[PDB]
Amino acid sequence: HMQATLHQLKVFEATARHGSFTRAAEELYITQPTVSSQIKQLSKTVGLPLFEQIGKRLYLTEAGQELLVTCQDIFQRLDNFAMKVADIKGTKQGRLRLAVITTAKYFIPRLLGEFIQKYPGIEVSLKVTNHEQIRHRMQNNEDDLYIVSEPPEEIDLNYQPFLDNPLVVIARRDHPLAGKSNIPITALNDEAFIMREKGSGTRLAVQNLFHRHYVDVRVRLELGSNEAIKQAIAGGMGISVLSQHTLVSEGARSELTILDIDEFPIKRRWYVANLAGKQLSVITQTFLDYLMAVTKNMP
Template identity: 50%
Template sequence: MPIRYATLHQFKIFDAVARHMSFARAAEELHLTPPALSIQVKQLADAIGQPVFDQIGKKIYLTPAGEALMSASQDILDRLERLAQELAALQGLEKGRLKLATLSTAKYFIPRLLGDFCAKHHGVETSLFVGNRGILLERLARNQDDLYILGQPPAHMNVIAEPFSDNPLVVLARPDHPLVSEKNIDPSRLRDVPFILREPGSGTRLATEEFFERHSVALKTRMEFGSNEAVKQVVASGLGVAVLSASTIGAELATGELALLDVQGFPLERKWYAVYPVGKQLTPVARAFLEYLFATAPAHWLALSRALAVSSGSICPTTLP
């Protein structure tokens, strides 16, 4: 069977299997049985005239033909999705889907912004994936979502990164920490202070390590965690200090569980970015959400920064955006 007779159903099935590298997980996503998927993938491979998967032990891997087919499948399915949205737009309808993936650090404000966007566009279906930086970069490499919210764009990937809001990093401690009452603390004073860090590869950790390396300060790592909540809990228990995004700590500052340290060079000026692969054609819905971020997120952060300054007392409002 020539490739021109391959069906969209087969491309969709192959795409799911290739993304998950598992017939079982793809079957769960598509609500089909693994044998049914296997038959369709075999027929597609027959049409190509080459195997698309190698099976080694219990794992499957894409062959060179499979990698080419995966790229083509994504192009076909993405183009069909854009066509559906373009046709809906021509009819004056608000329809379409938005697949958003965000860092766990941004979960403190992105869901609210997404909810407000959906309230203005009732016909849009949305999905939100929340994960750490490593998982998001894997999804970005596979082009699994429309947009990715990151605090530090990947330097090794060919992407477009559009900044839409400030994302300053601050130094946290328990309120009774000896340094809380001090002002303009030199970074060298933190050389022997235990640090609670995010996991290796985290954008927050990378920025923290780069800052202290520039000041010739070797961090004394006490613990590391894969979530902001765990870091905050350990800092609140008095086991060390930490550097986190200011967007994650409003509640703890308001209740007095945490306090800010006035360290020279902080807050670290960073941005939140909407990221997508170079060459990706954004759907009308994705473009509309991107424009909504540009218009709304800065005002959201301004309100948050004022709340942080008022609740903290250890940082002047003019030092935040």
């Protein structure tokens, strides 16, 4: 019974609705003898008579009544799918999956929550993790878009930069250098310093810049957590270098401050990426556009 055609079902259902081959033909802009043979073929496939002529009309047999609701269910299901596809296309349904490097937690979720108010039907997933996780997900095509800091050479990606990630010297509001301008980088000599964990991107960049300019800091502490570091600074433990976006909620009157040391900010970027040769969904390309938009004139 898979040998039946959709077209033969479409003829059958019309022929049952109306009571005649001819009325059906007129609806389906085909010929009455095409309808009759289509029905004979379909009855041969089913194995039973579908119709009985009584007076001027074709009435359904038991097997025909069953096939009618079978046809109605099937056509219902296709319509339903057609509705899905239409909602997808007009960004009123669908799924957006983002995997994002850790440092981007300070903007991405907020952007993403703005975007959903503007497209409520969308369902979202956000994964916030490290470079190794992200590489794995990329290898398995798990998300629509990936936001990273350093696009992995060994994976075919389509990407571009969209937002600068300055690393800046952060201090407590009462530090001597606070408010001072054009401060030479040698001024960091002998300063209590809170270092990020070994093997961190941030650590490595901070150390490289410090080796280049002969600066020797007193490492008071080593932590793995930017929040922890901000807190340690507040507590007087020292200064550090962190991504400026860690300062997003800080206002006019803050316990923290940026120092204005020369050779800073250490300049780094965030990229958007998708796998090379990927079919970008409607909402993905929509989101991509909205992203580049809101982060172009973003301080």
